[PDB]
């Protein structure tokens, strides 16, 4: 899908709790299993995907941080 469509998906989830703008490990899990099931059933564990994605270490994944995965998503 288009970039605007991914932001859309990102968005429904980031808002379920905490910062309505960023993903929590729970919200990322939720996103991943409903929308992209094989991202999370690869070599990394959700926990390990979370570490990779959280660049700062603020416990949230922003949309910009989320861009990494997109390559696999779009793939
Ligand atoms: Ca959130
Ligand atoms: Ca972060």
From Swiss-Prot:
Task: Name the Gene3D superfamilies on file.
Answer: EF-hand
State the InterPro entries in the record: EF-hand-dom_pair, EF_Hand_1_Ca_BS, EF_hand_dom, S100/CaBP7/8-like_CS, S100_Ca-bd_sub
Q: Which GO terms describe its molecular function?
A: calcium ion binding; calcium-dependent protein binding; vitamin D binding
List every position bearing Phosphoserine.
38
Q: Which SUPFAM superfamilies match?
A: EF-hand
Q: Which GO terms describe its cellular component?
A: apical plasma membrane; basolateral plasma membrane; cytoplasm
Residues spanning the signal sequence: none
Quick one: which residues bind Ca(2+) 2? 54, 56, 58, 60, 65
Q: Which UniProt keywords apply?
A: Acetylation, Calcium, Metal-binding, Phosphoprotein, Repeat, Vitamin D
Task: List positions binding Ca(2+) 1.
Answer: 22, 27
Does the record carry Phosphoprotein as a key word? Answer: yes
The molecule here is called Protein S100-G
Q: Which SMART domains match?
A: EFh, S_100
Which segments constitute the EF-hand domain?
A: 9-44, 41-75
């Amino acid at each position: 899908k288009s970039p605007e469509e991914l932001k859309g998906i990102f968005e429904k989830y980031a808002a379920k709790e905490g910062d309505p703008n960023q993903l929590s490990k729970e919200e990322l899990k939720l996103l991943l299993q409903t929308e992209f099931p094989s991202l999370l059933k690869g070599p990394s564990t959700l926990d390990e995907l979370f570490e990779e994605l959280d660049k700062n270490g603020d416990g949230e994944v922003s949309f910009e941080e989320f861009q990494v995965l997109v390559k696999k998503i779009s793939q």
